[PDB]
Design a protein around this nucleic acid. Structure first.
Ligand SMILES: [Mg+2]
Ligand SMILES: [Mg+2]
Ligand SMILES: [Mg+2]
Ligand SMILES: [Mg+2]
Ligand SMILES: [Mg+2]
Ligand SMILES: [Mg+2]
Ligand SMILES: [Mg+2]
Ligand SMILES: [Mg+2]
Ligand SMILES: [Mg+2]
Ligand SMILES: [Mg+2]
Ligand SMILES: [Mg+2]
Ligand SMILES: [Mg+2]
Ligand SMILES: [Mg+2]
Ligand SMILES: [Mg+2]
Ligand SMILES: [Mg+2]
Ligand SMILES: [Mg+2]
Ligand SMILES: [Mg+2]
Ligand SMILES: [Mg+2]
Ligand SMILES: [Mg+2]
Ligand SMILES: [Mg+2]
Ligand SMILES: [Mg+2]
Ligand SMILES: [Mg+2]
Ligand SMILES: [Mg+2]
Ligand SMILES: [Mg+2]
Ligand SMILES: [Mg+2]
Ligand SMILES: [Mg+2]
Ligand SMILES: [Mg+2]
Ligand SMILES: [Mg+2]
Ligand SMILES: [Mg+2]
Ligand SMILES: [Mg+2]
Ligand SMILES: [Mg+2]
Ligand SMILES: [Mg+2]
Ligand SMILES: [Mg+2]
Ligand SMILES: [Mg+2]
Ligand SMILES: [Mg+2]
Ligand SMILES: [Mg+2]
Ligand SMILES: [Mg+2]
Ligand SMILES: [Mg+2]
Lengths: 59, 58, 90, 95, 42
RNA sequence: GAGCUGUACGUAAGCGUUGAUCCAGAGAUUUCCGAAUGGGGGAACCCACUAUCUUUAGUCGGAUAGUAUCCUUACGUGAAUACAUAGCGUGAGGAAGGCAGACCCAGGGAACUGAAACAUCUAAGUACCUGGAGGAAGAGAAAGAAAAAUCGAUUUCCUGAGUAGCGGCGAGCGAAACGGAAAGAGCCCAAACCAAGAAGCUUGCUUCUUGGGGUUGUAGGACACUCUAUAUGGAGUUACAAAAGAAAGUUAUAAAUGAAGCGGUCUGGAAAGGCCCGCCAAAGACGGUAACAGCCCGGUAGUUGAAAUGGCUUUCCCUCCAGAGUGGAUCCUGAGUACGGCGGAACACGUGAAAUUCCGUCGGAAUCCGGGAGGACCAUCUCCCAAGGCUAAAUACUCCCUAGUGACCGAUAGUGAACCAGUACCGUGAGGGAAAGGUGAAAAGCACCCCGGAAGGGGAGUGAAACAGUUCCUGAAACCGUGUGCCU
RNA sequence: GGUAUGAGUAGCGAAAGAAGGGUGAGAAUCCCUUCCACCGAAUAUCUAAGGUUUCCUGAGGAAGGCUCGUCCGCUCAGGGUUAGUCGGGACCUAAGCCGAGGCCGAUAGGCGUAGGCGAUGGACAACAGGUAGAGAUUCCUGUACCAGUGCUAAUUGUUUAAC
RNA sequence: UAGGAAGAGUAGUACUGCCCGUACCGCAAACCGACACAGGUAGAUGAGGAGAGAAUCCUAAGGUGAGCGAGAGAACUCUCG
């Protein structure tokens, strides 16, 4: 969370994209019954929310 | 339907027979449609005869 | 964004039977037009989409001990890729 | 709760008064605690579950927290608990 | 031939939310059903 | 400060002393519908336009913003029609809708019923509809009450008093002032007049805007002179002008600390109970804990506590500000007003001998040598100065919040609703509207065996109890059976 | 609210069944076969309304089904509906409804102009095959049409003015 | 026609075409009738023999044997000869 604040906005924006790609893949593996560590999904969702919160704070 | 100068308008009260039976009625104001200029521009508005009595535009 | 529009793949006897026919069945956002689904699938999977067919499923009424209610309404998109296009895996 | 997992408690009420044990688990929402070798119950377990031969299992059941007192390693007796601050964080104190 | 010959359209046109909202007395009805706490207005 | 990932009877995968879950303050995010406002619409949907960006070879796509109507007000365009007005466009402001089924003010306003019928009258200005609101509203600083000779705005309570009155003088309706209390607070205009414009050109006279001035009764003011102030003082956002800030204190919204029995023994499944000893108490509230606990737990008295936000009180800032005296030449002191006739209404007061107050209509004063009232009216006397406005408190009510209380209910009661209830269900719809609480201290929720497809049983086991076995405290009566002492 | 009595009574809602085989703990009632019988301007095939998952598959047999039940429109799980051309909207208007300004009116509102909404009507381009547990003019094959778009190529026009 | 105009059409090529509905019942056990109710429910199609015919009787395609049965064959009742 503080580590996110060390990054630039553009750098944060890139981290979001990466997390959204990850979240999509998790949901895809979950659907095909190949996930196992199902707790990752919640982690990633929160992370994305954290990014978007920091960015909105910047403005 | 109301005097623009005053605010005269319909008001209710009783009609009474001999025998004093009561029934609801109104008293309308004696409103007349006339051209005046309350605001700079003239316009046809309801005005009471009473309001016209004396000094109004027309 | 594209990964909002495409929710998850659909894995059923029916959905799995048409994978060999290069038809991929997805559950997509209920507001997504078949045009948005075409461009989303191309962004996500790097494929050439030939046609997208789409259908709305109304919620199914389910009981659980004197409490009744509807499952989610779904929008199902079948995406046919081109002959030359690379496959999606599942 | 005045006790927590790891604490050595004496049991002051019930079929097991006078017995002491370690606090294996705490259920603060129920205000109950699980003391090693206290309040043993015979669970008639079907084979189905993790236990591929089932059977009548003898395990600990939770006691109410108000039924155990904390053991002070110095005295080795049941003591009521006070709270005193060293500087950074507060700590439990015997009386 | 019984009373009650259903029509989706006629039901909403006569009793629906937008018809209720379109008149003052219709709005009194909505306000009354909200006051009683009905799940279903209109 | 050690567990946590809500119910609720789960499985899984995870998190947490590098402080999670949790609690409080403040932020961020906040789909669609709904006044719903870009247009439409059968609410939760459909369909756009204009900019800017983005995507593609381009259609096709995507993102962000704007785009309702009315009112007021600037500005611009602008017809019949010459000036111009209307109209049209743009930009600012503002409104819109909801509701606490309460209280308040206003517009509109029943009937059943009572009168042992019924028409006046009552019910009742109630119910209800509509509008306007505000935390309260309304009222309010005398054209008042009186006539102990005086009082000094309003409101509310006690009293007066079921009096005086009203009334098919029937049924009924029914004051007020004085007296005693709660609470208290007073103010600003209009007009003379002065100044400054502005215009009309009545062409140096008149009416229009802004500022000053000024606020009242044996009168006050203007206007003349006179004394002191021009922030010395005084006053403020609750009226009396109106926006701003700070700081300190305090309260609220999380918390912290907190005395004393594992005392002995008896019964028991269990002890908080019995018996016998102690102890704390500014703490013997309440609840929980295996039966009834000041000393077991959460706590309680007492004493501490707030990063953040909100409230309040002070102080400071800031802002604003002339007030006595003397005359009485002249001038001013609310006009289609007061009042009157006619027709209604409100006044306790039903048109009456009917003052007082309001509405419609018509008529219509005086204007300081003036005017109003004292229950027709006149005269005298007394008290007041209308036709402009503002004003806290004492009063009303409670959808709410916090803390409490009850010779209030205890599951057919108490809310319709102790339980997923305005639900289910009924009705086209408005609308109507239920039933339904209790295993145990703890799931220890009956391994295993037996009959049976299962259900269900019988053992075995758990438990204090299973004749407590997942709706499971108690378990009456009706009613249904089996057995049999006496009779038929 | 519970429980009787009537009472093992009335009723079991128009109709043709039979046997063999199967399944199953259990069969008049489920499945299969054969014969018989009934409708056939319908008791057949579409399709609008309306209903809203009742559809398909696999389990089930407490309750529901006027009997039974291994079965089911019932219970529990999974599934299943594909469109430029079909019907509706991004087109049109009727009746009717709403209605800026406006007219009228104690309040509320009523009416109505421009302008809108509104099919039951107007306009408008796809056929035949295949396939199948459950969709098909929708999927697939073949062959089309309608409206656009870019990209090549010539052609013509670029102020008496192609379009 | 008024207007607007340097782009326009022709040929060929390949590409583009949104939203809603689409299951199933639909003279019915799924709709309206509290019911798996002899009732009601618009429209398209609706074969053959004999026939004027969509009448009638028997059939085709197609659909169906109707959610209690087994006996008995009294009174009586109903519907029939
Ligand atoms: Mg479709
Ligand atoms: Mg109905
Ligand atoms: Mg922390
Ligand atoms: Mg809109
Ligand atoms: Mg009587
Ligand atoms: Mg203590
Ligand atoms: Mg004992
Ligand atoms: Mg007990
Ligand atoms: Mg107790
Ligand atoms: Mg009068
Ligand atoms: Mg009266
Ligand atoms: Mg008088
Ligand atoms: Mg008069
Ligand atoms: Mg008078
Ligand atoms: Mg007198
Ligand atoms: Mg009198
Ligand atoms: Mg005066
Ligand atoms: Mg009750
Ligand atoms: Mg009881
Ligand atoms: Mg009740
Ligand atoms: Mg029971
Ligand atoms: Mg009998
Ligand atoms: Mg009989
Ligand atoms: Mg019989
Ligand atoms: Mg039958
Ligand atoms: Mg026939
Ligand atoms: Mg079926
Ligand atoms: Mg049965
Ligand atoms: Mg079955
Ligand atoms: Mg028309
Ligand atoms: Mg029209
Ligand atoms: Mg239309
Ligand atoms: Mg089918
Ligand atoms: Mg195709
Ligand atoms: Mg179909
Ligand atoms: Mg039927
Ligand atoms: Mg018919
Ligand atoms: Mg046949």
């Amino acid at each position: 969370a503080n580590d996110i604040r060390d990054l630039s906005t553009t750098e944060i924006q890139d981290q979001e994209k990466a997390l959204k790609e990850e979240l999509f893949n998790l949901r895809f593996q979950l659907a095909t019954g190949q996930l196992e560590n199902t707790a990752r999904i919640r982690e990633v969702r929160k992370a994305i929310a954290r990014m978007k919160t920091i960015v909105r704070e910047r403005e | 339907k109301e005097c623009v100068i005053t605010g005269r308008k319909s008001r209710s009260g009783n009609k009474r027979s001999h025998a004093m039976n009561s029934s609801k009625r109104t008293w309308k104001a004696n409103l007349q449609k006339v051209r005046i200029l309350v605001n700079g521009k003239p316009k046809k508005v309801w005005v009471s005869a009473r309001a016209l009595k004396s000094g109004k535009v027309e | 964004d594209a990964r909002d529009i495409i929710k998850r793949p659909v894995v059923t006897e029916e959905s799995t039977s048409i994978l060999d026919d290069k038809k991929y069945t997805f559950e997509v956002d209920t507001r997504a037009t078949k045009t948005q689904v075409k461009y989303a699938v191309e962004e996500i999977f790097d494929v050439k989409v030939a046609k997208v067919n789409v259908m709305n499923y109304k919620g199914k009424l389910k009981r659980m001990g004197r409490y009744a209610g509807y499952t989610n309404k779904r929008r199902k998109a079948i995406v046919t890729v081109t002959a030359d296009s690379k496959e999606i895996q599942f | 709760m005045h006790v927590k997992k790891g604490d050595k408690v004496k049991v002051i009420t019930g079929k097991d008064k006078g017995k002491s044990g370690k606090v294996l688990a705490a259920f603060p929402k129920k205000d109950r605690v699980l003391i090693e070798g206290i309040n043993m119950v015979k669970k008639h377990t079907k084979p189905s579950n993790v236990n591929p031969q089932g059977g009548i299992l003898n395990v600990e059941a939770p006691i109410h927290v108000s039924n155990v007192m904390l053991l002070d390693p110095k005295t080795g007796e049941p003591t009521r608990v006070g709270y005193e601050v060293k500087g950074d964080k507060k700590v439990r104190v015997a009386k | 031939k019984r009373t009650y010959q259903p029509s989706k359209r006629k039901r909403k046109k006569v009793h629906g939310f937008r018809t209720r909202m379109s008149t003052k007395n219709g709005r009194r009805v909505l306000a009354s059903r909200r006051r009683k706490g009905r799940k279903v207005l209109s």
